[PDB]
Scaffold this motif. Sequence first.
Motif, PDB file in Angstrom:
ATOM      1  N   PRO B 128      40.122  22.683 -11.634  1.00  0.00           N
ATOM      2  CA  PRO B 128      39.013  21.772 -11.943  1.00  0.00           C
ATOM      3  C   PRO B 128      37.990  21.774 -10.817  1.00  0.00           C
ATOM      4  N   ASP B 131      31.210  18.310  -9.972  1.00  0.00           N
ATOM      5  CA  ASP B 131      29.896  18.534 -10.552  1.00  0.00           C
ATOM      6  C   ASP B 131      29.025  19.362  -9.614  1.00  0.00           C
ATOM      7  N   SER B 132      28.134  20.152 -10.207  1.00  0.00           N
ATOM      8  CA  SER B 132      27.231  20.977  -9.421  1.00  0.00           C
ATOM      9  C   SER B 132      26.184  20.112  -8.725  1.00  0.00           C
ATOM     10  N   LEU B 134      23.098  20.580  -8.596  1.00  0.00           N
ATOM     11  CA  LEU B 134      21.803  20.660  -9.257  1.00  0.00           C
ATOM     12  C   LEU B 134      21.623  19.627 -10.361  1.00  0.00           C
ATOM     13  N   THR B 135      22.594  18.743 -10.569  1.00  0.00           N
ATOM     14  CA  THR B 135      22.502  17.770 -11.645  1.00  0.00           C
ATOM     15  C   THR B 135      21.629  16.585 -11.234  1.00  0.00           C
ATOM     16  N   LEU B 136      21.283  15.764 -12.228  1.00  0.00           N
ATOM     17  CA  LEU B 136      20.336  14.675 -12.007  1.00  0.00           C
ATOM     18  C   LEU B 136      20.870  13.663 -11.001  1.00  0.00           C
ATOM     19  N   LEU B 137      22.136  13.269 -11.142  1.00  0.00           N
ATOM     20  CA  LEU B 137      22.705  12.292 -10.217  1.00  0.00           C
ATOM     21  C   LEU B 137      22.798  12.857  -8.806  1.00  0.00           C
ATOM     22  N   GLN B 139      20.997  15.311  -7.497  1.00  0.00           N
ATOM     23  CA  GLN B 139      19.654  15.500  -6.954  1.00  0.00           C
ATOM     24  C   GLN B 139      19.070  14.186  -6.449  1.00  0.00           C
ATOM     25  N   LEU B 140      19.254  13.103  -7.207  1.00  0.00           N
ATOM     26  CA  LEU B 140      18.751  11.805  -6.768  1.00  0.00           C
ATOM     27  C   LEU B 140      19.429  11.358  -5.480  1.00  0.00           C
ATOM     28  N   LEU B 141      20.749  11.532  -5.390  1.00  0.00           N
ATOM     29  CA  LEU B 141      21.453  11.185  -4.160  1.00  0.00           C
ATOM     30  C   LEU B 141      21.068  12.110  -3.015  1.00  0.00           C
ATOM     31  N   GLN B 142      20.803  13.386  -3.307  1.00  0.00           N
ATOM     32  CA  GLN B 142      20.331  14.293  -2.268  1.00  0.00           C
ATOM     33  C   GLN B 142      18.980  13.846  -1.728  1.00  0.00           C
ATOM     34  N   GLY B 143      18.074  13.430  -2.616  1.00  0.00           N
ATOM     35  CA  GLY B 143      16.791  12.921  -2.164  1.00  0.00           C
ATOM     36  C   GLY B 143      16.929  11.686  -1.296  1.00  0.00           C
ATOM     37  N   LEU B 144      17.855  10.794  -1.654  1.00  0.00           N
ATOM     38  CA  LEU B 144      18.118   9.627  -0.819  1.00  0.00           C
ATOM     39  C   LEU B 144      18.651  10.042   0.546  1.00  0.00           C
ATOM     40  N   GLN B 146      18.011  12.867   2.189  1.00  0.00           N
ATOM     41  CA  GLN B 146      16.932  13.431   2.994  1.00  0.00           C
ATOM     42  C   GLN B 146      16.011  12.341   3.526  1.00  0.00           C
ATOM     43  N   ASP B 147      15.590  11.419   2.658  1.00  0.00           N
ATOM     44  CA  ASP B 147      14.683  10.361   3.089  1.00  0.00           C
ATOM     45  C   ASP B 147      15.334   9.473   4.141  1.00  0.00           C
TER      46      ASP B 147
END
Lengths: 294, 154, 184, 110, 166
Positions: B128, B131-132, B134-137, B139-144, B146-147
């Motif tokens: 198993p 999640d990759s 590149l997914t929406l969740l 990506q949003l956490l990645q943006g958080l 970085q900021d």
Amino acid sequence: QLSPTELTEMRNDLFNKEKARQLSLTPRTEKIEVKHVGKTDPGTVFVMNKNISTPYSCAMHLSEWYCRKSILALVDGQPWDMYKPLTKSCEIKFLTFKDCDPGEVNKAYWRSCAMMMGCVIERAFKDEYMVNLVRAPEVPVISGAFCYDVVLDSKLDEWMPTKENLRSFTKDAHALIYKDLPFETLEVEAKVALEIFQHSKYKVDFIEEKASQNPERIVKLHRIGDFIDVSEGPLIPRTSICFQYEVSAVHNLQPTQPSLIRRFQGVSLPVHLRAHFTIWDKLLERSRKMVTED
Amino acid sequence: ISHGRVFRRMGLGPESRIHLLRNLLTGLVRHERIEAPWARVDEMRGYAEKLIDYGKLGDTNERAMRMADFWLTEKDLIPKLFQVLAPRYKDQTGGYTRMLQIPNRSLDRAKMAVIEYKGNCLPPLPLPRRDSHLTLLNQLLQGLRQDLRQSQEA
Amino acid sequence: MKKTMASQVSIRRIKDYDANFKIKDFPEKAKDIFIEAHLCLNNSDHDRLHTLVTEHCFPDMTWDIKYKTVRWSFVESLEPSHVVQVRCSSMMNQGNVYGQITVRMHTRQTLAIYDRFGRLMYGQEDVPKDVLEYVVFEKQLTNPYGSWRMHTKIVPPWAPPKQPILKTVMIPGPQLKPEEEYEE
Amino acid sequence: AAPKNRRTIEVNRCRRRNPQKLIKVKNNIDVCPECGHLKQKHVLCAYCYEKVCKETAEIRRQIGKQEGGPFKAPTIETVVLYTGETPSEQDQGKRIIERDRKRPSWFTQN
Amino acid sequence: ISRKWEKKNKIVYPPQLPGEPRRPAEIYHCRRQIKYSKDKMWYLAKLIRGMSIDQALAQLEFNDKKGAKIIKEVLLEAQDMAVRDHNVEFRSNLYIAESTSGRGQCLKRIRYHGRGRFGIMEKVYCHYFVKLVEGPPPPPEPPKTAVAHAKEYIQQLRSRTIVHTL
Ligand SMILES: [Mg+2]
Ligand SMILES: [Zn+2]
């Protein structure tokens, strides 16, 4: 001028008239061989009806798992709306939220939530006030929130929404999600869209620039309930896809002397990517910060 | 009342329990991947983990040789343990085995599991995967991230 | 018919078994037989259909409409029927002699096929359209009580494709066993 | 002890059709991303696990045929090679198993 | 014996005029003489009752009971002839209408007991019936709200008359 309640009525009538015309020019029953290309159940061939069948209809042929999970359809390598009728026989692929590269799915979801949130702007304010939307910026997903450009009346120059006002916007959106309106798309000629949105100068500019970049000079219009908007790119099938919704804050662009621009912002998450309350709270804090395109 | 009892009551008794675990361990050594009832796999996992630690001690160590002699019914596996398994995990300090759940067997609907030694030559199991990125969740956490990262450095 | 000697050779053999036989009147009764056969399917009168069509033709007209309602009607005949070719069976093959007569249909027909629950499935009951098919009749020459009946229809390789069905059909691909990888 | 009176069907219905006696609906069912067959979240997919075992069985059959006798476990590493393959630079001094088949896509080569 | 369920697939309705709506497709299927207890099979039939065909298949696939696989095949072949022979367009547009089990023909065998006694055991057989209706499954009945209780209580109070008088 024309009252808002009649403006929606005529715009819906024009949309229905165009939809009937597109069906009328289409012949009665033609068969297109749509082949299923994908990593699951390959080699399946769908003999559907041109300009009547949809990628959703092919999904129901296989199983409800495709219907529930497939957010976007990939026709010949380009994105396709779930409920958009097929125009020719071609290979088909379905995309889900939890894929290797769901970039198009995220972008489609991002634009879909902008229209839903953009739709409740007109109904939110008083009837005496006037509200005219500008456009939907293609803000990246990684920015943390989706934004929509709105212009308000000359009375609300110094007026800024409070917590309760933003709460009311969320409640209307959740009711819009609760009503579960499917996203309806229609590819139409530029001149047809111009007379639909003749009462909005910004929409007229948006239509003319979309036609300019399009060699065929045709634009796509999406309809939710009684609301019609000019959107670029495919959207999610229905409003029930999004689970957690909220509008973060309102920001004023600069300069304001020539024209007052209000950048409403919000963040959303679908059912398939549900997050914890603590995680969602941090995303709300991040989304409240103003975001600008590159 | 069973508080702090870390050993399951399996087989016909303490002697049978050791023998059953020993047979599973021997098959795990020889074949590098076996399937067995879930509870028995979990109990045998600890013994499998400690075997390499005794194997790392070296064949010249008399304590490890006696332990390997008892725990390996087939004597041909003792050279394999001291010259194949131990050299493979010399850089690894733990987690030599991974255990997964497989669908229940049709004979008695028993809870089934598969245990195998890492680095085997067999085809990989369908492990198993999370999640990759590149997914929406994500990506949003990645943006958080970085900021937040740019906020502290400034 | 003039350049094919086998046609008149077959005709005289049929005349040998039945002197009162004419070729100029057979198409008229053949069309009446053809029409009578098809209007029978509307009420499914299989008892009378046995006297109008051959036993080989019977399964083709009954199996696919066993639990369906057929509303078939005749509206017009575009062109008069012509005797395309007449051929006979080999002599004393199994104690019986058969004769085949081929006739050409170019008329206008109507179809209306409904499913078990009455929902429309195939055809449309109002507009008629031209039908071009080849019809072959057979009769038991040796049997005294034999008669000409609807036997077989000929589909040319150049025939136009049939009208598309109303509903959509999904064709599954090659099902794959776990060890068998997908191959185009 | 024996029953005193016959239990009526009304009482039996209240017991047999009790809510806890019913089968609970499972909400941990999802489609496998690879083969499209149903699987549980915490359980390996039946389709993919079974296809790995068959390949493992075939390789193990080749293992024994090359082995040719019990109690002869090799003291070296093992690497399986498919058709149209050559030993790698790091694959030296290790037992080679030849499979008369094409390497599966899921069987990534190190 | 009675085999009315099989004949229920042979009834044909007259063609429908365009005025009336579409009659949903229905398919009657049943498997006879299953080596299973009708009481045990009842739980599986009730479980998948009212759900979609594909959801029912998912629930039955991971069930440990022996009867689960029997119904799974029965549902699978019921879906096959529905599309193939019953003019069903979408194979996933089906929901279970009624699923139940009935007692089949059973044999009587002797079970030996101590002291020379015996007991008559029974080899239980049962049938399984299932009906599939084309279309999405109907929504479940929502719980009756407090306001619904309020109006009902008012109606009872307003419906009372003076009794045993004129
Ligand atoms: Mg005795
Ligand atoms: Zn799988």
